[PDB]
Design an enzyme around this catalytic site. Structure first.
Site, PDB file in Angstrom:
ATOM      1  CG  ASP A 109     -14.611   4.293   0.658  1.00 43.28           C
ATOM      2  OD1 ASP A 109     -14.097   3.475   1.445  1.00 43.28           O
ATOM      3  OD2 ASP A 109     -13.946   4.843  -0.243  1.00 43.28           O
ATOM      4  CG  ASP A 116      -9.219  -0.531  -0.223  1.00 39.94           C
ATOM      5  OD1 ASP A 116      -8.268  -0.741  -1.008  1.00 39.94           O
ATOM      6  OD2 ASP A 116      -9.329   0.517   0.433  1.00 39.94           O
ATOM      7  CG  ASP A 153      -5.622   5.065  -2.892  1.00 43.77           C
ATOM      8  OD1 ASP A 153      -6.763   4.769  -3.321  1.00 43.77           O
ATOM      9  OD2 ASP A 153      -5.226   4.785  -1.751  1.00 43.77           O
ATOM     10  NE  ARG A 158      -5.136  -1.008  -1.781  1.00 42.75           N
ATOM     11  CZ  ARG A 158      -4.868  -0.178  -0.769  1.00 42.75           C
ATOM     12  NH1 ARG A 158      -5.297   1.081  -0.790  1.00 42.75           N
ATOM     13  NH2 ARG A 158      -4.169  -0.611   0.270  1.00 42.75           N
ATOM     14  CG  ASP A 213      -1.839   1.146   1.363  1.00 43.32           C
ATOM     15  OD1 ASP A 213      -1.772   2.089   0.557  1.00 43.32           O
ATOM     16  OD2 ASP A 213      -2.665   1.134   2.298  1.00 43.32           O
ATOM     17  CG  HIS A 218     -13.110   5.950  -5.407  1.00 44.84           C
ATOM     18  ND1 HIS A 218     -14.142   6.006  -4.494  1.00 44.84           N
ATOM     19  CD2 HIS A 218     -12.008   5.583  -4.708  1.00 44.84           C
ATOM     20  CE1 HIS A 218     -13.681   5.700  -3.292  1.00 44.84           C
ATOM     21  NE2 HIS A 218     -12.388   5.443  -3.395  1.00 44.84           N
TER      22      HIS A 218
END
Ligand code: VND
Ligand code: CA
Ligand code: CA
Lengths: 83, 851
Positions: B336, B449, B525, B509, B209, B583
């Site tokens: 979310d 996620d 992201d 993800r 991440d 998003h």
């Protein structure tokens, strides 16, 4: 007699009115179907205000008119809620 | 902030492996130990200095593949072998000794033409078709196998890895003579054609991440697919390195030749060589190993509207009404993490989402869906039933002292279920039953996620290497499939809750080889900037090449606020990409598409209409991906393998073989340069109908509403021209067929149809697959799969033929009906022929003749 598009683009036999194919540029030949991209469907909606909706919302399975008349062949049964 | 993440030098096993430089390998095959077996050849290998003994298991496989596995002969402890990624035990082909000398054994696969030469000293493998060398293994002598010693300790920043097993890394090099272009090994924010790593970092595969990740660098991102494709004018090859541990990949170019080196922290050496010869052969070879793209329910190929976060049920309904009030289609609205009770997943905030069933009922009445986020980290909370169940049943990832691992994530202190444990996955799947996940309904789907897993106070923002999983394996052994197991268990849960009937939709993800079987992925992201818009093409193309066809990027960018023009261009780009979701970060301004000035709204609505019109085409491409393993979104070189000028193109792409897309990706552009490939090929501008001959680079002027799209001559594209508010509303509507004539006056296409959301196409063969073909002056519809029958009102309302002359008359014949005459319209300027209302059922054989 034949039908003439309200914008004069064409004249078509009356059996091409509401025949589920868009023949008029203004959508005037399909007031009762979803065939034309720029058409409108008139909801009389007795007991409330009458309404115009997009042709694309005729028989889309969604109740747009309180009188339910926009869903006549979609598998969605719309109860009358014009009260 | 990159000091958070190890360079190869800061990774001790990468430092050790990468310090081994090309030279004379110390490994040697002991030809006296060779055994030729039912499924494989085994031979002992020895390290000349250390005298460590390894076993090489070499297998020829059906479909022109070779598998190489290397493990220790006498291991102190078992080494990890990646489970659940291969869909089957790969069917083997017999090996034969067809040649031999003092230092060599030549093996034949079945009866040829593929041969494997095992060189004894130094150890080496060469793969040949007939006498042509395809690939070499250990040719640069870079093989390294750290055996398990008598049971090092390592720290990075403030985190300590106890490393109880010591150095156990494995590595191996591969030589690709004739190859100058390699692709794949996602996920990296880097170009489609992979770069040489010689003067810099290796490409890293470790699901991580990375906050505000940057472009054009080899840092590891959220997913890892250890699959590399090599393409030249002459051949295509693929290498599938089946290892689930942290992996670094070195790439060097040197008559032209590319060398590939894989370096993994633990596990065995397990690699598949996929010999093509065409890239579609490689697609089939890889698909037979790891499976194919799950067929998406149709709605999930529509437009998704999302942000962090929609406020409450009222906001959700206002967004729903906003789409209808502004004549914009949308299939799904997303919830979310702020929809749950303080990031306790499977719950609902009691003030802002008090009646989820009623909200889902209102959306169902608009024939729309909802997606709710469910992350794998579980808040440590004795009032949280999920945590109590997992704690009480011992289903959490553990530390070496046997306690449940606790880290930091969105809800604060949290534990991590051991998704490598099949008992845990069954529990997770059962949690999605409508009785367990209270407030859920059949039109609620799921987003997984943070499943790398993301651990805010962990090393590199992920779990400790020496955490312990089911069977005693370390986290370092299993890391890159942790996310896949979350994706898999979630998807199984959506199937089971329906009694096995409904197809799932799950976005994930993190991912690994095999994730295509479980749904969609997106590139995480990204940022609201032009270069992030550009990079969405090479990132999703690198995923497509390795089997993940259901890919996309956040439309508008996740971080920061896009200017209106960038948002318009991003909608146009996203409308032609497989997973199509807008998003945005928590602190961004609202950017639902009707909040813009009318000129921007209009261009965006036009893009949404194009996407919804193309759903029959999208659905067929995904059916072809599901059945054959062919990618939906494709680089130009996949369709034009001999045109070397396409080998690096990444500002253009194809959808199947029919549509070439060049979205505008520069602010204030006045035109684009479109490369239209193919000798003796024509392309039709779908906006103007202008025909263009290939090969050429065409300068095409654009405005704000332009989406440069060309249909290839020889193709037939099915469209729903009646755009409605969601795909569910459209699924009984008539089809318009767009026939683009080749220079030979021919074209062909397919169309797949089913109920749009169940497994009935498979369990009951309830589906249609139609073939449309044009030649001479006749358009024919026939069955491309007679096993499929379907009750459907879908009919053919229109045929549009590009590149056609004026006929004298048009005649339709359909079995069961009298011959009929069709009226038609012709444009002499554009050579476009419109056939009015054929009116024939899409399930019927029929033919139209232009006289
Ligand atoms: C600063 C946030 C960085 C991580 N973003 C992830 C979490 C979340 O923000 C909320 O669940 C999602 O909106 C993103 O899409 C995810 O990728
Ligand atoms: Ca009509
Ligand atoms: Ca309706």
């Amino acid at each position: 007699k034949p039908f003439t598009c309200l914008d004069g683009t064409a004249t078509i036999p009356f059996d091409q009115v509401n025949d589920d194919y868009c023949d008029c540029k203004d959508g005037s030949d399909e007031p009762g179907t979803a065939a034309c991209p720029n058409g409108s469907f008139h909801c009389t909606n007795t007991g409330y205000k009458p309404l115009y909706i997009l042709s694309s919302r005729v028989n889309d399975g969604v109740c747009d008119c309180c009188d339910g008349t926009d869903e006549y062949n979609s598998g969605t049964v719309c109860e009358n809620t014009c009260r | 902030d990159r000091s958070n993440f190890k360079t190869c030098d800061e990774s001790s096993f990468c430092k050790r492996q990468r310090s081994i430089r090309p030279g004379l390998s110390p490994y040697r095959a002991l030809l006296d130990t060779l055994q030729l077996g039912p499924d494989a050849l085994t031979v002992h290998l020895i390290h000349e200095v250390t005298k460590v003994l390894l076993v090489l298991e070499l297998q020829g496989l059906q479909k022109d593949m070779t598998r190489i596995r290397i493990d220790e002969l006498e291991p102190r402890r078992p080494r990890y072998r990646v489970p659940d990624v291969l869909v089957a035990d790969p069917p083997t082909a017999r090996l034969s000794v067809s040649g031999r000398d003092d230092n060599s054994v030549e093996l034949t696969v079945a009866e040829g033409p593929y041969k494997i030469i095992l060189t004894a000293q130094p150890f080496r493998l060469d793969l040949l078709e007939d006498r042509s060398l395809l690939l070499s293994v250990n040719a640069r002598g870079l093989m390294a196998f750290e055996h398990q010693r008598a049971p090092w300790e390592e720290t990075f920043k403030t985190h300590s890895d106890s490393k109880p097993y010591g150095p156990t890394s494995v590595g191996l090099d591969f030589s690709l003579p004739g190859m100058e272009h390699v692709y794949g090994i996602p996920e990296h924010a880097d170009s489609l054609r992979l770069k040489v790593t010689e003067g810099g970092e290796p490409y890293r595969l470790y699901n991580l991440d990375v906050f505000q990740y940057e472009l054009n660098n080899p840092m590891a991102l959220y997913g890892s697919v250890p699959v590399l494709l090599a393409h030249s004018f002459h051949r295509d090859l693929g290498i599938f390195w089946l290892n689930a541990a942290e992996t670094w990949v070195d790439i060097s170019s040197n008559t032209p030749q590319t060398d590939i080196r894989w370096m993994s922290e633990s596990g065995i050496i397990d690699v598949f060589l996929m010999l093509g010869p065409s890239v579609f052969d490689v697609f089939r070879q890889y698909a037979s190993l790891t499976g194919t793209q799950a067929l998406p329910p149709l709605f999930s190929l529509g437009y998704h509207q999302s942000r962090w976060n929609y406020r409450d049920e009222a906001d959700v309904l206002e967004v729903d009404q906003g789409f209808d009030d502004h004549n914009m289609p949308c299939d799904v609205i997303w919830l979310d993490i702020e929809h749950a009770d303080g990031k306790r997943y499977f719950t609902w905030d009691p003030t802002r989402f008090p009646q989820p069933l009623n909200m889902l009922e209102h959306l169902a009445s608009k024939r729309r869906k909802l997606v709710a986020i469910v992350d794998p980290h579980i808040k440590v909370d004795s009032g949280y039933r999920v945590h109590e169940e997992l704690r009480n049943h011992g289903l959490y990832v553990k530390t070496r002292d046997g306690s449940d691992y606790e880290g930091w994530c969105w809800p604060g202190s949290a534990s991590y279920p051991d998704f490598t444990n099949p008992r845990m996955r069954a529990w997770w799947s059962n949690m999605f039953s409508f009785d367990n996940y209270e407030g859920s309904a059949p039109n609620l789907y799921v987003w997984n996620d943070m499943n790398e897993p993301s651990v805010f106070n962990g090393p590199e923002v992920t779990m400790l290497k020496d955490a312990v999983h089911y069977g005693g394996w370390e986290h370092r052994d299993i890391h890159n499939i942790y996310g896949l197991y979350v994706h898999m268990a979630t998807a199984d849960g959506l199937i089971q809750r329906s009694g096995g009937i409904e197809r799932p939709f799950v976005l994930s993800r993190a991912f690994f080889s095999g994730s295509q079987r479980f749904g969609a992925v997106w590139t995480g992201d990204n940022t609201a900037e032009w270069d992030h818009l550009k990079i969405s093409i090479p990132m999703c193309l690198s995923l497509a090449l390795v089997g993940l066809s259901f890919c996309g990027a956040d439309v508008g960018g996740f971080f920061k606020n896009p200017e209106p023009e960038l948002l318009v261009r991003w909608y146009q780009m996203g409308a032609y990409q497989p997973f199509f979701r807008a998003h945005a970060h928590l602190d961004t301004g609202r950017r639902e598409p009707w909040l813009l000035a009318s000129q921007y709204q209009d261009a965006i609505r036009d893009a949404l209409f194009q996407r919804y019109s193309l759903l029959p085409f999208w659905y067929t491409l995904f059916y072809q991906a599901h059945k054959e393993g062919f990618p939906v979104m494709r680089p130009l070189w996949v369709q034009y393998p001999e045109d070397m000028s396409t080998f690096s193109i990444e500002d253009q792409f194809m959808l199947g073989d029919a549509l070439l897309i060049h979205p505008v990706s520069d602010a204030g552009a006045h035109g684009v340069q479109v490369y239209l490939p193919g000798q003796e090929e024509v392309w039709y501008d779908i906006q103007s109908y202008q025909k263009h001959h290939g090969p050429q680079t065409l300068y095409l002027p654009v405005t704000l509403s332009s989406i440069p799209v060309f249909q290839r001559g020889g193709t037939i594209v099915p469209r729903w021209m009646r755009v409605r508010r969601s795909s569910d509303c459209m699924k009984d509507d008539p089809i318009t067929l767009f026939v683009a004539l080749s220079p030979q006056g021919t074209a062909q296409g397919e169309l797949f149809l089913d109920d749009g959301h169940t497994f009935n196409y498979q369990t009951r063969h309830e589906f249609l697959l139609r073939r449309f073909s044009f030649s001479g002056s006749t358009l024919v519809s026939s069955s491309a799969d007679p096993k499929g029958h379907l009750e459907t009102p879908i009919w053919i309302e229109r045929v549009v033929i590009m590149g056609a002359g004026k006929p004298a008359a048009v005649v339709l014949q359909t079995k069961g009906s009298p011959e009929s005459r069709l009226s038609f319209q012709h444009d002499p300027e554009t050579s476009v022929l419109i056939l009015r209302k054929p009116g024939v059922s899409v399930a019927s054989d029929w033919s139209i003749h232009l006289r």
